[PDB]
Structure formats: C-alpha cells, structure tokens
A paper describes a structure:
A comprehensive search of patient-derived phage display libraries combined with high-throughput biochemical and functional screening resulted in the discovery of highly potent neutralizing antibodies, with diverse epitopes and distinct mechanisms of action. To understand and characterize the molecular basis of viral inhibition, we determined the crystal structure of the potent ACE2 blocking ION_360 bound to RBD and of the complementary non-receptor competitive ION_300 in complex with RBD.
Consistent with its antiviral potency, ION_360 binds to the ACE2 receptor binding motif (RBM) on the SARS-CoV-2 RBD, which is a feature reported for a number of antiviral antibodies. Of the 20 RBD residues within 5 Å of the ACE2 receptor that make up the binding site, 13 are buried upon ION_360 binding. The interface features a mixture of polar and hydrophobic contacts, including the involvement of six aromatic side chains in the CDR loops, from both the VH (Tyr33, Tyr52, Tyr58, Tyr110) and VK (Tyr32 and Tyr92) domains, as well as a network of 13 hydrogen and salt bonds, accounting for a measured KD of 1.5 nM. The analysis of the RBD: ION_360 interface suggests these mutations are unlikely to affect neutralization potency of ION_360. Whilst Lys417 is making a potential salt bridge to Glu99 from CDR-H3, the subtle reduction in residue volume of the K417N/T mutation, leading to the loss of a single salt bridge, is not expected to impact on the interaction of ION_360 with the RBD from these strains.
Residue numbers in the entry:
A (entry chain A): 337 to 361, 366 to 384, 390 to 516
B (entry chain H): 1 to 136, 139 to 222
C (entry chain L): 1 to 214
Amino acid sequence: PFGEVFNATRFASVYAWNRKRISNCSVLYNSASFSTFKCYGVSPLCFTNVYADSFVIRGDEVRQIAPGQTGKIADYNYKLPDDFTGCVIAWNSNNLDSKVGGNYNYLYRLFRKSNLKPFERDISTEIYQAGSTPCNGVEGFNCYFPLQSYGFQPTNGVGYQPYRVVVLSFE
Amino acid sequence: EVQLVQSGGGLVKPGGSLRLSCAASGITVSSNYMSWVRQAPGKGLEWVSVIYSGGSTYYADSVKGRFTISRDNSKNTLYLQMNSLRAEDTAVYYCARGEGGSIVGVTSDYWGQGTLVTVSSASTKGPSVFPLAPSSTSGGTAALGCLVKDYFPEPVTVSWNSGALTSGVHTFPAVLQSSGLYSLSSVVTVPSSSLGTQTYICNVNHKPSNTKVDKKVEPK
Amino acid sequence: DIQMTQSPSSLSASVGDRVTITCRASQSISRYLNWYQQKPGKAPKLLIYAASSLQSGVPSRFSGSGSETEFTLTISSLHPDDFATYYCQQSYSTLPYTFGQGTKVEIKRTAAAPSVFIFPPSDEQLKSGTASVVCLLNNFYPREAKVQWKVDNALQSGNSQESVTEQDSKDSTYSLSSTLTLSKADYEKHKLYACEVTHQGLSSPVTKSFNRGE
Ligand SMILES: *[C@@H]1O[C@H](CO[C@@H]2O[C@@H](C)[C@@H](O)[C@@H](O)[C@@H]2O)[C@@H](O)[C@H](O)[C@H]1NC(C)=O
C-alpha cells in the first residue's frame, strides 16, 4: 500500500502535510530513482504502528527533513523529533509539479510565533500579528497572511524545483 | 512612528567583548524576523546575523561562533553579543526588522540609527580645542573656527553657540593622523563688520573621554 | 552563494537627469532582488523590493525592473538630495543574504570657485608644543582642487592632510580643509606661510598667506 502514497497523483502542501496510517504485511529502495533516501536508527511487521507522511517542498529545503534541523520548513511546517527512527525519501518532481508560467498550488507557512512540536500540524489562516495592535482578520502593516506559495516553473534552478517527500516513521 | 533605537557600541581591545542593544517601538521583536547588518569604514554592507521569531539563528561565516543574536520580550529589545573581537569587526552596526527578503513581513523596512564599534589596542584620549581666529576678510564675510586635535576614538560632536548658529557652518570629517589619533576642524562664515560685536563659542563634545569643552574664538 | 556585480561604481548627473544603475547576478535569481539607498554614515533605506515593487514611502521617481540575471534601478528625475551610494541585494541564496558593492551618485552642476581662508596656529596650541596651519576652501564645485603649502616659497610635502565635506543638500557644493602640522621648533624656523589653490572655477591660482607673528 506504499503505492497509494508514493504514486499518488496529488500531493499535499507541506503546511497541510498528509499522514497515512499503515497496517500492512527494501522493495522501494531497489526500484528507486530517488535523490534522497536516509534512514535513522535503522538500516535496510516488526512494529506496533507505522506512518507515512507526504508533501512537496523546494530542493534546497529537503535538508531540513532531518533530526535536529532548523529553517522555515522545520520550524513552521514539518518537524522531525531528535530521536527519530524511520526513513526520509525524496525525489525531484519538476515534470509533474511545475508548469510554464508557474504552478502556485503548493504553499508553505512563512509566519509563526513559535516552532512546531515534532509531528505537529498547523493549517490555520489567521492573520499574523507582528506588532502590539490586533489585526482583526485584515491584512496590512504588521498584519501578514501566514501562507506563501511556491512558484514552480520548469526552468527554476534545482534548488527551487519541487521535490516530493515521504517520511516513514516506525513505532 | 515605528522606530528602532540602538545603544551600546564603543571601543574594545582585540579579544574583548561588547553587547549591542536595539530597543523597538511599534514592532514586537519576539514576533518578527530580526537582523543585524554592519559596514566597515569605507566598505560595503554585510549581513551579520538573522533571528526567527521561533528562535532559529543564522550568521555570516566571518562571525560564526563569535557572535550571538538574542532578544528580550519584556524590554522589547534585540541584542547582539560580540566576543573575540578583532580589527576586521571595526564597523558601524545596524539593527533591522526582516531578514533581507522580498515579501512584506520579511523585507527589511525599518532600521536603527547605527552604532560605531571600534576594535583597537589604542587607548582613549580626549581632544585639545584650539581657536581659528579671524583676521582682516574677503567679499564682505570672514571665516573662523575651532581645531579639535589629537583624540581617540571617534566620534566628536561640535555645535556653535549651543546650537544657535547653524547656517554657514562646516564641520569636516575627522582624519586619522600617523600618530593614531584623530583630528578635525569646524568652521563658519560670519559678517566681517560684526567681529567686535558678535561672540562665537564652539561647543566640543567627546563622549568616550567625557570631555566637554567650550572655546571662545576672538579676533587677534 | 551568488555574487552581485553592480555597474557603474561611480556616476555624476545634474538635477533633473535620468539615472540608471545596473546589478548583475552570476546566476539566475528570478525576481529575488532589493535596492537600498544609503547616505554616508546613516542607515540604509529600502527603495525597491522583489525587483520592481515600490516600498511604501519612497518617492515615485524610483523604479526597478529586471529578472533572472540583469536588474536596473531608475531615478526618473534626479533631485539634489538624491546623492548617496545605492546598493542591490539578492534574496535567493542561503541566509544571510549578500549585497552588491555599491554605486555612488554625485550631483553635477556649474563650476563654482572657492573662497580661500588661512589660519595661523593659536598661541595656546604653540604653548603645548605643536603648530597647525589651516587653509579653508569654502563652497566650490567640482571636488578636484590642488592645494599647495609654501614656506618661504619652498613647496611642502608629507606634512599636510585634506578633508572634504559631503555635497551640500541644496546647491551641491563642497568645502575642503587642508591642515599643515609642524613642531614648534620647525614653525619658528620660517617666516612666510602660504596656501596656493588651483581650481577650475579660478582663472588664476589664489594664494593666501601670512608672516609668523606679524
Ligand atoms: C509506482 O509505479 C511504478 C511504475 O509502474 C506504474 O504503475 C503500474 C501499476 C503500471 O500502471 C505502469 O504502467 C506504471 O508506469 C512502479 O514500478 C512502482 O512499483 C510503483 N511504486 C510503488 C511504491 O509500488
């Protein structure tokens, strides 16, 4: 059933990252073409429960999907715990997730007052308050809409190209 | 008015430390991307450090390990702790909201006034103030001023008659002499006819040495 | 890390002129670019962000354009206070971002001769042991000026220093000081101290001078 998560036609925005509970039975790595395949605590059921998380991000941000990492993605979108045991699997998806003139469908959270706890998800769109005055739901000075969109165009440098990501966590 | 008011630069020896302050108003420091930027004398701008509202910090390679960006919410102040200072770190430092980005919220729209940081083995020394007296006298006007000689470090501030006289006043940028001490002059044009009538006092101030000097400039 | 090259490094233009400054990226950076203005020792001012958006406040005569690797900042009609150093800054690489090296803008105008003054050392300075002679060149344009110290008609060297103000905000002129510093013993060895000034706005060189004590 990893096919329904890897070969899914549509992926989630990283701020609204997707979580599939796996109740189930190295076939992934052997038929790879993956750019990132890093496992933590283990090298290639014997597990209570296993989760598959998937979303899209920039190429330069894949490094942040790792234990003890910092950045806009790790702080405000998707956080891995320090004791993480699992695998992080990523691959370039420019041919699907980029469009001429830009694909603006994939978003990320640019503003948050404090970091996310591990495996925390925040999909609120409340106006962010950068000063002492309340925003009352309206954008303006010191009152920012939290989400910002990626612009995936086919001719972006590899660091700004879309990468699909799946995170397997074992417990 | 949103403002960032800076404080606490100064002179310090190689190896020594210093903390810079940036008190903010109209902006919540703990809720924002914040930044420190600097400019060495006669050079370009260099981004030094960035901090996220969540707490993540970023540093230029030249200061990594030696500098620490920090903040305090109850005093709404941003701080830069500087350790293991060196001559290369001699610069004017600026705090700012944002991280240098290109989206409102992360754009660097407001800045502090800047503070000088001087990393030198040279000691503090107060200036001598000498009068540049008029004679007699060209084109109806006459010139006079004050020579402010042999001091360290910068800056000096000069005013005339406690701020009364401003039009016609030229205070020159200080020049570093081969002694290692700085020197400057302040000059002003005045009506030649009103020399034995008007009194001119130059008020020199050198904060690093706590020097306050007032020199009366008389025609001799 | 990305590296930004501006051009030109220096640039002179009259009040009302159109002005153009280019910033070149060593690789494509989309529209991740900002422009700042900075007066000499004062805080930078954000003018343009995202390559072409006018920052709130900034006068409409500033405008930016470009993408990928070539960006231009345009002042449609130069105002006399617009003299500064203009910086570009990419927002594409890893934090912390980097700047271009800067383009200095001076205001061009009609030539204006300097008024020359000369000051003997104060009696109180001579008591301290040192002697400083100051020569003042007031409100002139252009910046280039030759100032020669002559001591009993012997040209001096290596014992004077020049300082220049910033351009005046209203009429774009400069002021310059030249300070000759000697020991009291050296000062007492000569009589005629003169300051000979050459400048485009002067038909012939101008000398101001005195005699020691007189
Ligand atoms: C994902 O799909 C890969 C390619 O095969 C595709 O799917 C099969 C069922 C056929 O429809 C074929 O025409 C498609 O091109 C598989 O090789 C791969 O195993 C799949 N991923 C996983 C995790 O099973």
